[PDB]
Design a protein around this ligand. Sequence first.
Ligand SMILES: Nc1ncnc2c1ncn2[C@@H]1O[C@H](COP(=O)(O)OP(=O)(O)O)[C@@H](O)[C@H]1O
Ligand SMILES: Nc1ncnc2c1ncn2[C@@H]1O[C@H](COP(=O)(O)OP(=O)(O)O)[C@@H](O)[C@H]1O
Ligand SMILES: Nc1ncnc2c1ncn2[C@@H]1O[C@H](COP(=O)(O)OP(=O)(O)O)[C@@H](O)[C@H]1O
Ligand SMILES: [Mg+2]
Ligand SMILES: [Mg+2]
Lengths: 86, 57, 456, 456, 456
Amino acid sequence: LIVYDDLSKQAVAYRQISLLLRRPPGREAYPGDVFYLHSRLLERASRVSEEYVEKFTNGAVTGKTGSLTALPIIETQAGDVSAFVP
Amino acid sequence: AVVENNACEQAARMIAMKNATDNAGELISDLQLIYNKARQAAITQEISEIVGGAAAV
Amino acid sequence: SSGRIVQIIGAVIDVEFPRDAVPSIYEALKVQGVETTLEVQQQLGDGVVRSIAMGSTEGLKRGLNVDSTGAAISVPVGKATLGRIMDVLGNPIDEAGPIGEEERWGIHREAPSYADQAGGNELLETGIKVIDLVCPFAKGGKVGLFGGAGVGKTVNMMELIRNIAIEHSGYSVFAGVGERTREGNDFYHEMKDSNVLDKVALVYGQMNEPPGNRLRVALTGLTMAEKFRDEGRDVLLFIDNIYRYTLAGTEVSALLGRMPSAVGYQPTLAEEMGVLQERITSTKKGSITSIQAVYVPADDLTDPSPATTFAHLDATVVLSRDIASLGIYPAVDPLDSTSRQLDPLVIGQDHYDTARGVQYVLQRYKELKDIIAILGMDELSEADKLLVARARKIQRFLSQPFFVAEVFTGSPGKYVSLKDTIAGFKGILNGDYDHLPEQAFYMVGGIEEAVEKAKK
Amino acid sequence: SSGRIVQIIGAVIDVEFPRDAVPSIYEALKVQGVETTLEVQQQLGDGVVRSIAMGSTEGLKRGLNVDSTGAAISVPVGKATLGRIMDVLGNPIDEAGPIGEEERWGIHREAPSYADQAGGNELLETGIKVIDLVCPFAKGGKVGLFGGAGVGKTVNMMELIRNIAIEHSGYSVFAGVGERTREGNDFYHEMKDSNVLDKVALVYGQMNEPPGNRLRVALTGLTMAEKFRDEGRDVLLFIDNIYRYTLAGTEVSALLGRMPSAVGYQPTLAEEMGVLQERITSTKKGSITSIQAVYVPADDLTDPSPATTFAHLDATVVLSRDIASLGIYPAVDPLDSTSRQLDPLVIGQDHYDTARGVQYVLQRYKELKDIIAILGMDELSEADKLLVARARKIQRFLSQPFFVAEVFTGSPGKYVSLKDTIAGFKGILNGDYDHLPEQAFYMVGGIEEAVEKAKK
Amino acid sequence: SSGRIVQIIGAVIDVEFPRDAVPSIYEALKVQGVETTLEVQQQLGDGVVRSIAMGSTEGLKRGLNVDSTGAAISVPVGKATLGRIMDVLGNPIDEAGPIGEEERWGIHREAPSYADQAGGNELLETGIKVIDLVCPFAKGGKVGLFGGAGVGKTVNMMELIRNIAIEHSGYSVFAGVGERTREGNDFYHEMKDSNVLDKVALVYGQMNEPPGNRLRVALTGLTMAEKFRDEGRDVLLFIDNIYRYTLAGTEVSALLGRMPSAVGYQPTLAEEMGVLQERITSTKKGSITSIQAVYVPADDLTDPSPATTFAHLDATVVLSRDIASLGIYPAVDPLDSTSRQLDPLVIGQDHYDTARGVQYVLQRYKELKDIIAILGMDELSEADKLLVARARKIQRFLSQPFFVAEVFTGSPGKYVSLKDTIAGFKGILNGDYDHLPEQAFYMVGGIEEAVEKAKK
Ligand SMILES: Nc1ncnc2c1ncn2[C@@H]1O[C@H](COP(=O)(O)OP(=O)(O)O)[C@@H](O)[C@H]1O
Ligand SMILES: Nc1ncnc2c1ncn2[C@@H]1O[C@H](COP(=O)(O)OP(=O)(O)O)[C@@H](O)[C@H]1O
Ligand SMILES: Nc1ncnc2c1ncn2[C@@H]1O[C@H](COP(=O)(O)OP(=O)(O)O)[C@@H](O)[C@H]1O
Ligand SMILES: [Mg+2]
Ligand SMILES: [Mg+2]
């Protein structure tokens, strides 16, 4: 089980690096790959098959599925769910 | 009966105009939040166009 | 001959080749020590070309040797693709071995000519009340499901894949462009257990993937659909999210040296959309019926990507968050949604007048919202009170329990014919149901079930 | 070695040094023959550094010699700074001679580590009833102060400055971030007249100073507070306005040419706030508690400046023009003011229930007052009339005579413990003082003083 | 000596000359072979000058030789210009052959000095009710007709030309800047058919012409007016759209290498406007009475261009889209419009009280309009109900059919006098017409006709 305390603070940190590297901003001044910042992270939380575990461990672990559960956290302003990062 | 109904009418009208005053306050509060969003977005878009035009010149 | 990596910036790579051996635009290249594939986007001069990697660039370095393949990315096509899962480069990703391909086609092609176009108007019944009433679909036409995050697009599409496969007997092609890997796994096993898999070709490039994959997966799936259309067949082409093709283009645009346009979009936004969208069409040889989901950024329908997509479709279904918040599903907006088939010469006067009557009532109810919010319904005229009561019933009768939504609530799914749809709304407009309670119309399929629900 | 000025563009100066003598980032440089200090911001390469002048650049020219100092801007610290006015560089702006300093510290350092944090959420006893009851301050915490002019902001700061020094053996530091020269002179005389000047160090960055001065004054005042904390003390750091610290950062970021962020703020907005706010904490040696005045742009609490600041605040004290009109001082609004420490797991169930009990009575009384102003006092129930009587007693018991306010109140000042505060309000909530008149609770201090005032 | 074209980008052209022979700022250049002229905007250094072409660039090539003329664009001035149509370079654009010129003046000049300024306040009657009431004009002053698209700027200018230019015994200049070529043809045939053409110099630069032409036509028309003023004459100067001079500068600004300012305008917006507007003035030698039409982008009076224009004018007439959208013409707003002449010490107390009286009634009605739309007319006071009726009648009595608008209105044109205007509005304010219906005041010249329309 993994908890990300503020995924909205990770987006603010990545926006700072992108603006200092002069990458052209988009909506709410966030970089063009801000969706991919969160999507490539959260796609790793998942349940894998017995065949995946058997292949990864070279046969050492047989008959078990593996999993990673995620609880990301997002702060909103004035309860607005329609903003770009949320 | 007619005079007591008129007293009841003014009392009902007081509650109706109190409710109308309170209902209008909720609409004003929601529009102010939408206005602040538009205020922040206009400043961000103008700055993006000025930085974009000065990178080209 | 061969070249050498000279620069690497994220997903974009510059390679230098001898002046007499410079590769062509869209030509595929392979890195010698890792076998990573690159697609040429532009020629910079002095033998240097700029390319996008069709995989991860982590571990690559300057000076590595690169081989030009002499052709664009080529994928397997035909009967051998049915019941198989493939990636952007046409490799199998289902662990079922190599594809028994007879031929391969390059993923880049020109759209069919003006003289090759088809004039089809044959009505397609979906079994969904709101769609069949105000958004009638047609065989060989294009449909777009517009909506923000969590409004109903993947559910409302999977219900269309289930309902359209009842009358359709040909092949289907599915292209997963930048969406959840779990939903691709759920859909594959559902069709495998249901024995539907041997008539569907599956292509994937989900959110976990680098920008080059997400940018070209749409072309790979469309190339397989064009093979079946050109064989003289009637095929279905489903695109999981067409907005991701445009977004993958935005992530790479600044790296390609292009000046940004409005709200940070690539300057080529409308051309990148037209080059793909014009290939997705029916011709004099065969037909392609296509359904595409269109994401709406931050619920803004005026955003450049959604705004540029409307002109490429025959039917537009607009989902709303305000409607979904009331409990109504499918969350379609009758006043924003429309179709080219909503014409008296195509659907007949009875359907056309019922649909126009529903829109008139819902439009008038929308005008009274602010007055009703401050002063309540009791201040309205006797005519407006009757219209608002019918508007509330129409709005609830548009709801429908789906056979794919059963897991969410428990209720059984309903299929409603076009005849039953017209009869129900015509009766509510005429006033034949003015006595039944407003909650009797919510989640009931056909109009007769509203009469039975009112008995409780 | 020494460098040469190579370019001057407003407050931004570029200096060239020999390749083996290039100064470090944040290092302070001195122009030869002129009283001008330059702080290094960036290393451009080729032996050239970009810097910001800590004063006017008028009369400077290219080719002037510049000397490296080997360290960041270094300021005097300790006992000698008390009762003195200083600029951003630590120079004595008052005409009182040199500061009797024994040590100097650089203004830039890392916040205390994960292992240096003190422990449990210990409270700071201000001795002010309304604050210690409804707005409890934690040691090492940050307090946001809200309200207009003429509502007692200065008097509230002077009372806190007196109480921390006399009742807790601590000291105070005041950082005038973008200080108005007229108000800076008035505050210095008011503190001298109120006999609190020898308990506080004054650091001023006036509005007419360049952006670099207004940005660094908060770090100069914080460096003096860090020396007092290291002596084993609990310290108060007052920041004249935290919005002006944010704006000075926006101005400097624009001068350095960085690409602007959302709503036009600097891209480093959250990091610049974090670097300042993370040094204000409770450690194993001592603590720094901060009271910061907050300005809200366009009354929009969602604006990046207020939103970034509210993530660091632990309490909010709101000053009301309406409460000041009734003659009550301090003018804190017990309903709008809040604290993260007002939790039964932090302050205990007895203090929490007493504070929530007071807020419940005052909130219900605000509603009853609107009924009295419309329908009349005769429409209220007997229980409501009793609640109005208790609410008026609670409302007057929140008032207190301050030692710095004896000139206005004509009464001797009072310090009230948290134990006496809880006991007094608990008694009024339970009805133990229902027989006393409302005038007995006004300007008395502890509950025993109200009982004695009622006999006069 | 001669130079060579080195670069061409749109309307901007760079020309290289010998270093000992660089042409001056604003100097005119001629291309060899091709019939095109260039104006030096800047001297770039190394013998290169940046220029704007005064014709289309489609035929131009790099390497064409260019001749320096040694002076700025010089146009014919004096009596020979009357009854003629000319372009920006002063060439005749009518089939009447060469101009009988005796002197030529350069289009670039310094504004008259502070010691040369005039001081007259002689009131000018226009025959239009709203203008004569709230916007009184004066001889030798500056008038601006502010408004968006389709609200009446050209129509009001044509009515003002009819009521002033024809009757006047001095010379006139009409400058069509960025105008529709159809309006220029209609006006030429109108001046010719009315026998007025012998008193007017016509200069035309329409929307089909290059940016260099639209950037300088205003200076050509003004140079002809300055020759007449400096001879001791009283002159009329009409400019159909001065916004088009600013826009031509915005279109070329970025190609001239200038960074953009707010709302995408050129950084030189206020100086380019001041350099032109300060020459359009009356002096101790002679007088210029001027009427300019000012376009308002998207109807927003806060846009930088309209906002910078108000300070240059004596009389500001504001046209409202909301009034035009109600069929009321002329669509003038009495609350936003104003004039320096609306002073009791300049006109009289009776006129001033009538104007302020009308404004007071219309200002109070603006808050009641929103009340009536939600709660109805019956909830207003007996004084408010009466005032609202007078405000709606005043709003209609501002309307008047013009002689130049008969093609749009169908009814004949009405000229109304100052005394007639004052008497009509005082009658409605005092209640002398409370019994007449609201529709009787719509489109009826003086007050008598309103009494007659009520009977039809
Ligand atoms: N009846 C329903 N109750 C709750 N959620 C529903 C219902 N019907 C549809 N949905 C929502 O439909 C969404 C389908 O995809 P959606 O979020 O609209 O598109 P996308 O993920 O592609 O942007 C699901 O996330 C799900 O939450
Ligand atoms: N505790 C108090 N007791 C009595 N009067 C007070 C008190 N606090 C403020 N006042 C009155 O309010 C005035 C303004 O307060 P001050 O602290 O100077 O507010 P500000 O600094 O914003 O001007 C004081 O001069 C005094 O007259
Ligand atoms: N006073 C008026 N009476 C009637 N129609 C008018 C009047 N003023 C403007 N219009 C209408 O507007 C158009 C002419 O106005 P015009 O002067 O061209 O406006 P603008 O200069 O603001 O674009 C015509 O369509 C005409 O019918
Ligand atoms: Mg989805
Ligand atoms: Mg016009």
